[PDB]
Amino acid sequence: RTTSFAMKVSSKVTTVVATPGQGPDRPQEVSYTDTKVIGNGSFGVVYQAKLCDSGELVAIKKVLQDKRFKNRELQIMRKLDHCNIVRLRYFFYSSKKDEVYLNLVLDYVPETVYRVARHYSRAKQTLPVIYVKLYMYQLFRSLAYIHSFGICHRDIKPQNLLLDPDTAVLKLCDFGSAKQLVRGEPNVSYICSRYYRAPELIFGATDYTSSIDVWSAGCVLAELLLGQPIFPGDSGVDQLVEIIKVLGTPTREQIREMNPNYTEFKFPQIKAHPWTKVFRPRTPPEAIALCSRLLEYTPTARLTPLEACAHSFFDELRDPNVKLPNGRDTPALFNFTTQELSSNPPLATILIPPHAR
């Protein structure tokens, strides 16, 4: 849910003095028009607009700046520059009364993983594995990038995964819950959206790590393969029941890794449900394999985002002769920087095929 505790009208042309996202504070006049509401979450209202100069479509996220909570959203986005993270072009502030709104001017991205998946669920079809591979691979790259800074998104879900269906590019967004997790400082338990919360979070752990994002991504992967969320339920208990009904009852050791405060409860022993019986019979084995290595009870047992990219499920993307169903060519997949590969540099042998040099 929530986080931790503590314009000139000149078409109808709006002109503001907004500060750019990258570099030092050097604000400039920005004019835009054709403003209309396009999306909303639980916190921010998102507008679309056209920049008067370039004519480029943008998205303007307008969030109320409450001083009762910790708003790292602007602070975090400004330090991020990755091809699988939505770019922050400019930001500015605007004003019932005595209220300050933060405005984030972002690149406009037309679709989300959620909306696309909803299409296939309505049509009683499954998203082609190529797109599953593509979307998930770009997601893990974004996670690898922000984790290298120690930043944890803490709200990985399909509604937060913007898509450009033409170019098949995924961009992570919504850093309203993100935080740089410091080993030693506690965090808020009730974080992340339902269906995608890590088991340790559900148990109320306050000493979790960035591996919660990996769990969420496993939930997304599973959802893409299934056509529905794998761990639904309104309450934490409901969701945990669903998890156990698939992964089997967590061992005392696994419980200790999540939250030591539950090690002495006698939980009924439920036999785990085989992953191959979970998904459709046409489901690729490596997808199933990847899921099981993401959806682990023990946080440290889960793959790292970089390791996940190196998984053999994404081997098709490393093929030099792979293309998009619409005919276009694959997006940027192998332009890894030293920062992205910081957690495990030798993975570059796998991540970067010889035909990408």
Binding site: G236, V237, V241, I244, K245, N261, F265, K266, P268, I270
Partner: peptide, 19 residues
């Protein structure tokens, strides 16, 4: 929530889906 109350609810639920 309290670990005691949470565990009770989960145990009650796990007993129903098992038997």
């Amino acid at each position: 929530v309290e670990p005691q109350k949470f565990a009770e609810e989960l145990i009650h639920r796990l007993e129903a889906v098992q038997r």
